[PDB]
Short mmCIF file of C-alpha atoms in Angstrom, two decimals:
data_model
loop_
_atom_site.label_atom_id
_atom_site.label_comp_id
_atom_site.label_asym_id
_atom_site.label_seq_id
_atom_site.Cartn_x
_atom_site.Cartn_y
_atom_site.Cartn_z
CA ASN A 33 -54.76 -69.44 12.18
CA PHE A 34 -51.60 -69.58 14.23
CA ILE A 35 -51.79 -69.36 18.01
CA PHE A 36 -49.70 -66.63 19.71
CA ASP A 37 -50.96 -66.10 23.09
CA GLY A 38 -47.98 -67.38 25.22
CA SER A 39 -49.94 -67.32 28.46
CA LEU A 40 -53.02 -68.84 26.73
CA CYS A 41 -50.88 -71.77 25.50
CA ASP A 42 -49.61 -72.31 29.03
CA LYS A 43 -53.18 -72.23 30.30
CA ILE A 44 -54.33 -74.94 27.92
CA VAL A 45 -51.39 -77.16 29.05
CA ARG A 46 -52.34 -76.56 32.69
CA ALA A 47 -55.97 -77.31 31.81
CA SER A 48 -54.87 -80.65 30.28
CA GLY A 49 -53.32 -81.77 33.54
CA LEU A 50 -50.17 -82.87 31.73
CA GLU A 51 -47.44 -84.27 34.09
CA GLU A 52 -43.84 -84.61 33.51
CA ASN A 53 -42.49 -87.47 31.36
CA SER A 54 -45.68 -88.04 29.33
CA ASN A 55 -46.23 -89.19 25.75
CA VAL A 56 -47.93 -86.35 23.94
CA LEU A 57 -49.51 -85.84 20.39
CA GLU A 58 -50.03 -82.47 18.80
CA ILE A 59 -51.65 -81.92 15.39
CA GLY A 60 -50.96 -78.84 13.22
CA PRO A 61 -48.35 -77.18 15.50
CA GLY A 62 -48.10 -74.32 13.13
CA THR A 63 -45.68 -71.79 14.28
CA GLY A 64 -45.07 -73.60 17.65
CA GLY A 65 -46.80 -71.75 20.49
CA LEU A 66 -48.58 -74.70 21.99
CA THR A 67 -45.71 -76.99 21.09
CA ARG A 68 -43.36 -74.94 23.33
CA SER A 69 -45.85 -74.85 26.23
CA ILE A 70 -46.14 -78.61 26.01
CA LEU A 71 -42.33 -79.05 25.94
CA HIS A 72 -42.09 -76.82 29.01
CA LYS A 73 -43.62 -79.91 30.93
CA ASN A 74 -40.82 -82.17 29.93
CA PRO A 75 -42.67 -84.92 28.17
CA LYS A 76 -40.91 -88.14 27.31
CA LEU A 77 -42.04 -87.68 23.69
CA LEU A 78 -43.88 -84.98 21.90
CA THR A 79 -44.98 -86.06 18.37
CA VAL A 80 -46.33 -83.38 16.11
CA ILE A 81 -48.24 -83.95 12.88
CA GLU A 82 -47.62 -81.17 10.33
CA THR A 83 -47.90 -80.79 6.51
CA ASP A 84 -47.42 -76.95 6.12
CA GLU A 85 -43.99 -76.58 4.52
CA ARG A 86 -43.76 -73.01 5.74
CA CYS A 87 -43.87 -74.27 9.42
CA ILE A 88 -41.27 -76.99 9.45
CA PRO A 89 -37.99 -74.99 9.59
CA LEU A 90 -39.12 -73.38 12.93
CA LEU A 91 -40.15 -76.96 14.06
CA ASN A 92 -36.74 -78.29 13.09
CA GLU A 93 -35.18 -75.40 14.93
CA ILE A 94 -37.30 -76.29 18.04
CA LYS A 95 -36.20 -79.91 17.76
CA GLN A 96 -32.52 -78.71 17.84
CA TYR A 97 -33.12 -77.68 21.54
CA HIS A 98 -35.82 -80.33 22.28
CA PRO A 99 -34.60 -83.86 21.20
CA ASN A 100 -37.95 -85.27 22.65
CA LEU A 101 -39.66 -83.57 19.76
CA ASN A 102 -40.68 -85.89 16.86
CA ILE A 103 -42.06 -84.36 13.65
CA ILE A 104 -44.20 -86.29 11.24
CA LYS A 105 -45.26 -84.71 7.89
CA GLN A 106 -48.58 -86.48 7.08
CA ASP A 107 -52.26 -85.68 6.71
CA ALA A 108 -54.05 -85.73 10.05
CA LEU A 109 -57.00 -87.49 8.51
CA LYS A 110 -54.78 -90.35 7.32
CA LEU A 111 -53.08 -90.89 10.75
CA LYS A 112 -54.28 -93.80 12.90
CA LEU A 113 -53.14 -93.41 16.50
CA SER A 114 -52.11 -97.08 16.24
CA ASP A 115 -49.51 -95.95 13.64
CA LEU A 116 -47.59 -93.94 16.30
CA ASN A 117 -46.42 -97.18 18.02
CA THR A 118 -46.98 -95.77 21.62
CA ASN A 119 -49.41 -96.02 24.39
CA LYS A 120 -51.04 -93.66 26.90
CA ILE A 121 -51.21 -90.91 24.29
CA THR A 122 -52.03 -87.49 25.74
CA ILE A 123 -53.41 -85.32 22.92
CA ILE A 124 -53.08 -81.60 23.40
CA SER A 125 -53.85 -79.77 20.26
CA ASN A 126 -55.62 -77.05 18.40
CA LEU A 127 -57.48 -78.60 15.40
CA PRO A 128 -57.69 -77.29 11.79
CA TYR A 129 -61.24 -75.98 11.43
CA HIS A 130 -61.86 -78.07 8.34
CA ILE A 131 -61.55 -81.46 10.13
CA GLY A 132 -61.92 -80.97 13.82
CA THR A 133 -65.00 -83.16 14.14
CA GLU A 134 -63.71 -85.85 12.01
CA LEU A 135 -60.42 -86.00 14.11
CA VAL A 136 -62.23 -86.06 17.41
CA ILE A 137 -64.44 -89.17 16.23
CA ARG A 138 -61.32 -90.87 14.85
CA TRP A 139 -59.40 -90.46 18.04
CA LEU A 140 -62.29 -91.58 20.26
CA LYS A 141 -62.63 -94.71 18.05
CA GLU A 142 -59.04 -95.48 19.17
CA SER A 143 -59.81 -94.39 22.73
CA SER A 144 -57.78 -97.46 24.11
CA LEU A 145 -54.61 -95.75 23.15
CA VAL A 146 -55.50 -92.44 24.74
CA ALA A 147 -54.93 -91.10 28.17
CA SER A 148 -56.79 -87.93 27.61
CA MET A 149 -57.39 -85.18 25.02
CA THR A 150 -57.46 -81.39 25.65
CA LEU A 151 -58.44 -79.79 22.44
CA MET A 152 -59.07 -76.29 21.02
CA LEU A 153 -61.98 -76.23 18.53
CA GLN A 154 -64.65 -73.77 17.27
CA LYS A 155 -66.92 -73.13 20.23
CA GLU A 156 -69.84 -74.12 18.20
CA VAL A 157 -68.32 -77.58 17.94
CA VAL A 158 -67.42 -77.84 21.58
CA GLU A 159 -71.05 -77.17 22.55
CA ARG A 160 -72.11 -79.98 20.38
CA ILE A 161 -69.49 -82.32 21.89
CA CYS A 162 -70.82 -81.42 25.42
CA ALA A 163 -74.60 -81.33 24.68
CA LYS A 164 -77.03 -83.51 26.60
CA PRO A 165 -80.10 -85.07 25.03
CA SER A 166 -83.04 -82.77 24.62
CA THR A 167 -80.82 -79.71 24.59
CA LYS A 168 -80.51 -77.47 21.53
CA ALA A 169 -77.05 -78.58 20.43
CA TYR A 170 -77.67 -82.34 20.91
CA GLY A 171 -76.56 -84.21 17.91
CA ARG A 172 -74.48 -86.97 16.27
CA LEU A 173 -71.27 -85.57 17.76
CA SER A 174 -72.86 -85.46 21.28
CA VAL A 175 -73.86 -89.13 20.99
CA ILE A 176 -70.49 -90.37 19.87
CA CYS A 177 -68.58 -88.42 22.37
CA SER A 178 -70.96 -89.42 25.27
CA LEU A 179 -70.70 -93.09 24.53
CA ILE A 180 -66.93 -92.98 24.82
CA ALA A 181 -65.68 -90.14 27.00
CA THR A 182 -66.25 -87.91 29.94
CA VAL A 183 -66.40 -84.48 28.28
CA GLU A 184 -65.62 -81.18 29.85
CA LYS A 185 -65.77 -77.57 28.54
CA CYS A 186 -62.71 -75.69 29.98
CA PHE A 187 -62.84 -72.10 28.71
CA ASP A 188 -63.53 -69.95 25.70
CA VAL A 189 -60.84 -68.64 23.32
CA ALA A 190 -61.18 -65.28 21.59
CA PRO A 191 -60.06 -64.69 17.92
CA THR A 192 -57.35 -62.32 19.11
CA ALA A 193 -55.47 -65.38 20.54
CA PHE A 194 -54.34 -66.16 16.83
CA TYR A 195 -52.57 -64.64 13.88
CA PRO A 196 -54.26 -63.91 11.60
CA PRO A 197 -57.42 -63.94 13.81
CA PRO A 198 -60.36 -66.34 12.91
CA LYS A 199 -63.88 -64.91 12.49
CA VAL A 200 -65.35 -67.14 15.25
CA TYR A 201 -64.65 -68.13 18.84
CA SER A 202 -62.66 -71.24 19.73
CA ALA A 203 -62.84 -73.11 23.03
CA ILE A 204 -60.98 -75.68 24.96
CA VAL A 205 -62.57 -79.02 25.70
CA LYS A 206 -61.20 -81.98 27.62
CA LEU A 207 -62.18 -85.67 26.86
CA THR A 208 -61.36 -88.50 28.99
CA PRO A 209 -62.22 -92.02 27.87
CA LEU A 210 -64.70 -93.75 29.96
CA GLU A 211 -63.55 -96.74 32.16
CA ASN A 212 -66.05 -98.92 30.32
CA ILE A 213 -66.51 -98.32 26.52
CA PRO A 214 -68.63 -100.16 23.90
CA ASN A 215 -66.88 -102.27 21.41
CA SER A 216 -65.56 -100.73 18.26
CA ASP A 217 -68.00 -102.66 16.13
CA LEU A 218 -71.02 -101.02 17.77
CA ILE A 219 -69.40 -97.50 17.73
CA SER A 220 -68.71 -97.82 13.93
CA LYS A 221 -72.35 -98.65 13.47
CA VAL A 222 -73.46 -95.77 15.73
CA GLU A 223 -71.34 -93.51 13.64
CA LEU A 224 -73.22 -94.32 10.51
CA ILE A 225 -76.65 -94.63 12.13
CA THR A 226 -76.39 -91.22 13.67
CA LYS A 227 -75.41 -89.65 10.31
CA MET A 228 -78.61 -90.87 8.77
CA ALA A 229 -80.76 -90.26 11.93
CA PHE A 230 -79.58 -86.60 12.38
CA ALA A 231 -79.60 -85.70 8.66
CA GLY A 232 -82.76 -83.75 9.46
CA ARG A 233 -84.20 -82.93 12.94
CA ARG A 234 -87.87 -83.51 12.02
CA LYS A 235 -87.37 -87.04 10.70
CA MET A 236 -88.73 -90.02 12.59
CA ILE A 237 -86.31 -92.76 13.21
CA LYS A 238 -88.63 -95.14 11.43
CA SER A 239 -88.30 -92.99 8.24
CA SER A 240 -84.60 -92.01 8.37
CA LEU A 241 -83.45 -95.58 9.04
CA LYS A 242 -86.04 -97.38 6.77
CA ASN A 243 -83.67 -97.89 3.92
CA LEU A 244 -81.03 -99.38 6.27
CA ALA A 245 -83.48 -101.25 8.32
CA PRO A 246 -86.76 -102.11 6.59
CA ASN A 247 -87.96 -103.76 9.91
CA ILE A 248 -87.02 -100.55 11.95
CA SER A 249 -90.60 -100.41 13.60
CA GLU A 250 -90.07 -103.89 14.89
CA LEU A 251 -86.61 -103.03 16.41
CA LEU A 252 -88.00 -99.86 18.04
CA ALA A 253 -90.66 -102.12 19.62
CA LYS A 254 -88.13 -104.70 20.75
CA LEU A 255 -86.40 -101.84 22.46
CA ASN A 256 -89.64 -100.37 23.90
CA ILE A 257 -88.96 -97.09 22.14
CA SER A 258 -91.84 -94.94 20.70
CA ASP A 259 -92.56 -95.86 17.10
CA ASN A 260 -92.72 -92.02 16.51
CA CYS A 261 -89.34 -91.09 18.03
CA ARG A 262 -87.13 -88.57 16.29
CA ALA A 263 -83.38 -88.47 16.44
CA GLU A 264 -83.14 -85.81 19.24
CA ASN A 265 -85.45 -87.98 21.38
CA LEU A 266 -82.99 -90.98 21.56
CA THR A 267 -80.30 -91.15 24.21
CA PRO A 268 -76.70 -92.26 23.35
CA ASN A 269 -77.56 -95.60 24.84
CA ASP A 270 -80.70 -95.92 22.63
CA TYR A 271 -78.36 -95.58 19.53
CA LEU A 272 -76.00 -98.22 20.82
CA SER A 273 -78.95 -100.59 21.38
CA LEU A 274 -80.19 -99.88 17.83
CA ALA A 275 -76.59 -100.60 16.48
CA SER A 276 -76.58 -103.96 18.23
CA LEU A 277 -79.86 -104.82 16.44
CA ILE A 278 -79.21 -103.41 12.95
#
């Protein structure tokens, strides 16, 4: 699903708060719509990660007029931000619908290298990114994002914005790493703990985490959490606390 809408691409860049002379990363630039909007703000470097062979010739052509365009042909799931050898990365990107959630978590894990992220995703995923505890969409993604970033829903994007059109609504979300973040060790554990915890909504934590932590009832008691708590009942901080004891 390639983005057209020229004005829409400019609105995403405006929403990002991108200033001149920044260091930008874009994934899956496709046919270049968002890419050109980014380049209109005169970044110091725009790095794009693209594998679709069909798309590169136009990207090579763009580079001919924009020497600050850098093109990398690699799998997005295989890129570490640390591999780009730059700091203060502003990520402005549409995400491929197969891997959006996976990329967001990967980037947040390397939040130290990140200025901000303004991302276009399925709206269903954006509501999960932004969900608060004891809300319908609260889940693993909410937990991970909440521990690491200030998250902000910007606006909805209709299927007609793309060619060909997707069947579902996209939306734009902005994520700005928090000034204080937990260490990477604890986040890595939270990532796995929440995959088990949220595998089913009805499951008590003392059941879902029992294989991992046979003494889980003891740990819940050490944290003064109900022995009968279920995953949706625990806050993001509760999961961090658990990670530090498992």
